[PDB]
Amino acid sequence: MIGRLRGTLAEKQPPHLILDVNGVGYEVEVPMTTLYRLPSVGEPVTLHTHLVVREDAHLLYGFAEKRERELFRELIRLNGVGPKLALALMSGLEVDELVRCVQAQDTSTLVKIPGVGKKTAERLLVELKDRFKAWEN
Amino acid sequence: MIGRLRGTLAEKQPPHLILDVNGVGYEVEVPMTTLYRLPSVGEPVTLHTHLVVREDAHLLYGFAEKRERELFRELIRLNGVGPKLALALMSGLEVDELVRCVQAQDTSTLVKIPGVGKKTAERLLVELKDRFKAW
Amino acid sequence: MIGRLRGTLAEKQPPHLILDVNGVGYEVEVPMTTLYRLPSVGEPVTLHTHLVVREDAHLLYGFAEKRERELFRELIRLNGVGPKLALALMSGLEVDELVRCVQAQDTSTLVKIPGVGKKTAERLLVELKDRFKAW
Amino acid sequence: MIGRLRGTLAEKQPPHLILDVNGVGYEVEVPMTTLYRLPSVGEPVTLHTHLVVREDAHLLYGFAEKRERELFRELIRLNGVGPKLALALMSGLEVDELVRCVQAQDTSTLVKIPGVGKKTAERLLVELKDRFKAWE
Amino acid sequence: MIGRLRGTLAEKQPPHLILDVNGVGYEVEVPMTTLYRLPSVGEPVTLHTHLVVREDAHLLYGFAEKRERELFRELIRLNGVGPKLALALMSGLEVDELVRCVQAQDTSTLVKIPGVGKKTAERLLVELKDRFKAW
Amino acid sequence: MIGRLRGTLAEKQPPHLILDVNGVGYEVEVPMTTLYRLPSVGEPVTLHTHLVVREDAHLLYGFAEKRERELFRELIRLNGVGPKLALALMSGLEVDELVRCVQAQDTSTLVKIPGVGKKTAERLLVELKDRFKAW
Amino acid sequence: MIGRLRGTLAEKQPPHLILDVNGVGYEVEVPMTTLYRLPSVGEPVTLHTHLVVREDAHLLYGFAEKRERELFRELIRLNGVGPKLALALMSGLEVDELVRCVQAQDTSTLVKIPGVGKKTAERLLVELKDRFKAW
Amino acid sequence: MIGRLRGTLAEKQPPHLILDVNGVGYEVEVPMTTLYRLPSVGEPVTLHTHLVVREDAHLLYGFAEKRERELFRELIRLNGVGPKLALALMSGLEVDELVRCVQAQDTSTLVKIPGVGKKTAERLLVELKDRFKAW
DNA sequence: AAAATATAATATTTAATATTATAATA
DNA sequence: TATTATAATATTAAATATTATATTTA
DNA sequence: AAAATTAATATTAAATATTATATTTT
DNA sequence: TAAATATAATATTTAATATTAATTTT
């Protein structure tokens, strides 16, 4: 439903944000890579958010680039990967690095990311090498 | 709940759009007929959207006309038709000739629509025999 | 969550509305009494809405006055009364007549309301006898 | 999803409010302490809200400070505590008073709060002893 | 699915029983009146059980007479009436006495039953009147 | 899970039965065609049952022939057909007659069945025209 | 629904059992204390089982004594205690020892049980000290 | 809950069975490897069943030997393998060949099984990588 | 190194049915 | 020139009982 | 004052096996 | 005017535990 938020940064409490959009402040969770690029509090920002709807909560996940949001959606669509595991994956390394690892089949880089083990790395490699990285994001 | 969005076209990635309504960009999925009518990116556009609410997602479906939204709601109220099938039906045919086809009991035209086979074709005909008027 | 909408009347298709609240058009269902007091299309309006959330839809119900919204909430809180039946009740009668009938324990007046029968009237009377005392 | 609302106080009937955020009036429930700090109707306000989503309702709970909102979230996160009980706790006591009660393991100060009994106070103490230790 | 159990009374722990139906001991909850008619532990006994199925429990409610089970089913099919309240009503009043009270609108007797207030008694009355038309 | 009950007919309350299978009495609902072929109470009888499981109830439906059970499962698997409509269809006419009617697209015979209208009859014909494929 | 099983011990691989009751082998999970008292395979045994029903599984938990089953039900009735934790508690300690620890508010004894942490220790103490009124 | 059924084979309609356990016939789905070992109709047979409980269905899956039932449980416990796929795998290859092929991480033999592709074969190989002990 | 413990923290749907290709085939 | 089975993809999803009120047929 | 019993009444919600990290031991 | 029969529209949580004011004996 919500695919982009364009407002002013109100509070900066990592990993979360408060993106003030004409009065309504949105609680948006961002990766550390996105955090490293945000301006100072009070400056305008534009995040490509992805809304995760549950039976007990609505959650927003903002990214500085559309490709990042697409990759996050494809990652959370996996059976064993959830929003926070995907966020850790995107924080540990870039999208280009992730696709290079997927097409190279190297679990050493993936296991280096906190929260990612050998089984998780194998599942990620399988489910992405199953024709998801044919075209670079 | 949401019946219309009046903002500016932020970006155009078919079949999806971002409609920047005062900062908040809404992801609306539109038929190809609607896409062939939208202005260039950065210009105002008004869409009559229908909000689909599930247990795990909130989806918006925009249309250039209100009658298209009404027809979409009628189509998705069917037990065998979902948002994707209704979108395919509305992209393949406009409202007028779709109504003509349903009133003419002509499954042939419905079959040519991608994603629409036969069984669903006569199911749609049966369920739309007496659902709407000549319009 | 949403307790009031303050925008401009965009489209008036009874019993539904579209309020262009800074671009976002909220589809609001209102009773006939509320419609009879609405301005023409394009003029500002203020509705005291009540949001009904289900597992497959979000619905908005607007009213001209806050007391009407409160009465609607208490009515739909009942085990046999839903948004449609409550809207019918508030269209047939205003707040004052409804409360006077509840205090007077009148049934024939409630039966005359379309969609309301003998059992519905009895259920309303028994469920509302204790209420409205505080006023 | 919603963590703050900066609008104009349109209506004020306790314990709820109506913040006119650019036309959309959000109905927000606030504790007594927050109500004793809001200006008169028609003046701008800023609440650090917490959106509670259930299977059949979306609810907003506003607070004048972010510390209050964080404490409310931690409280409702408890199994035996819901929004109403947390609001009663926060209305009866401030954040500092509740914190020092938790650290000192005081039940008399918690039972006086309406809606809070002996068993509820015991559960609150046992949970909040380990839920948070260092509070600024 | 289960409408009768014909076994031997293995345990008698009020208000619950254990019917050893060929090895499987079914745990059945019965009214006080039923307990007052059961034989001693180890003797054969037949109960007309009603199976209540929820998302997290399968419960059996046994009765000495079929009419008692029918009345329990009708009572629990109501809105605000449950197996606990229905069992309390059955223990407090016999089937004939309950029917007479329903016909005679004698709420005083119903209020005498523990766990029964005033509004719930009046409800029981009003729904039951047309739920059963004097058998 | 349960596809047959071989016990003794304990009670006969149409359209329901009680099969005393080694002590446990199963509540089984049967069509009129099956009802007419049952023996007297106390005599052994074998029913080919179909267990319907819901979020709040477990229901058994017994038939005198396996083909009847298969047809009932096929009918209730449909979109707008439930156990009640399927049982009405089974009671109204024989399995062979139902197959003949659906193969010949004879709606008039189906309309004569109580509780079966033109719209639902057309739905059944369209959904079962090719399902049987001559068994 | 099921409160006792009286059959024959068919298979015994800990911590689960197969209790052949007239052909139907019920797979029952038992604590180590019950395991140490079971007879050899093929001999009759009576277990006081507790049926746990979930949206996607039906589970049986058998015990050598009724009081053990009552304690298990009380333990799993807690908010933060599940069947696995309750079984670990009952295997690591007897009912008498567990109740004495609850009365004495002893956490050192409880933490010795594998899978039992401190926080769980004082939670169990707080809940059970008030749960046990008479015992 | 049900870990074994010991009755007489009443009806053999592959891939389904009706095992008459003291009157109650149980609908059991078994792999073809079980079909090639069952006795004639009317003869005693023991199956190590596994009960699959859904929101709207209770299902039984029988096997000739316990290790097959264990393997079926492990297979269906996966996040992308269901009872149908597990049954297809067990029918195509026996347990020992299946585990031998998993140890070798060979997909050529898994793809040959009807209903099994390459992606699913690789995923299930990763899932069943050598965690358990060799049979 | 090499494996063996607790413990905090995550993730949370298959089933069935149509539909459109694809390889081999009257 | 069409036919048939298989195979993968991508949807679509499940309610059910109860008042209340319409034409019709007497 | 001085302790106990009780009938409404407003809340509150039921979660279990799988990892991954840290610590510990041989 | 009294139903018959569809006919479609509509509404669809429980139970369990904790609190608290009123009453009764002490």
Numbering used by the authors:
A (entry chain A): 1 to 137
B (entry chain C), C (entry chain B), E (entry chain E), F (entry chain G), G (entry chain H), H (entry chain F): 1 to 135
D (entry chain D): 1 to 136
Article passage:
Holliday junction (HJ) is a four-way structured DNA intermediate in homologous recombination. In bacteria, the HJ-specific binding protein RuvA and the motor protein RuvB together form the RuvAB complex to catalyze HJ branch migration. During homologous recombination, the RuvB hexameric motors are attached to the RuvA-HJ core complex through the interactions with RuvA domain IIIs (RuvAD3) and thereby drive HJ branch migration and strand exchange between the two homologous DNAs (Iype et al., 1994; Iype et al., 1995; Adams and West, 1996; Wald et al., 2022). Here, we describe the cryo-Electron Microscopy (cryo-EM) structure of the RuvAB-HJ intermediate complex from P. aeruginosa.
The cryo-EM structure of PaRuvA-HJ region was determined at 3.0 Å with well-defined electron density. In agreement with the previous crystal structures of HJ-bound octameric RuvA from Mycobacterium leprae (M. leprae, Ml) (Roe et al., 1998), each PaRuvA subunit is composed of three distinct domains: D1, D2 and D3. The HJ molecule is sandwiched by two PaRuvA tetramers that dimerize through a pair of antiparallel helices, involving at least four pairs of electrostatic interactions and one pair of hydrophobic interaction. The two tetramers together enclose a cross-shaped tunnel of ~ 23 Å in diameter, which encircles ~ 10 bp of HJ arm. The protein-DNA contacts at each HJ arm are mainly mediated by the RuvAD2 and DNA phosphodiester backbone. Interestingly, all RuvAD2 in tetramer 1 insert into the DNA major groove, whereas the equivalent domains in tetramer 2 all bind the minor groove. As a result, the two tetramers do not form a perfect two-fold symmetry but are misaligned by ~18°. The junction center is devoid of base pairs but occupied by a conserved ‘RED’ motif (R54, E55 and D56) in RuvAD1. In the motif, R54 binds to the ribose-phosphate backbone of the branch site with its positively charged guanidino group, while the carboxyl groups of E55 and D56 may provide strong negatively electrostatic repulsion for strand separation. Of note, the base pairs at the branch sites of RuvB-free HJ arms are disrupted and interact with D56, whereas the equivalent base pairs at RuvB-bound arms remain intact.
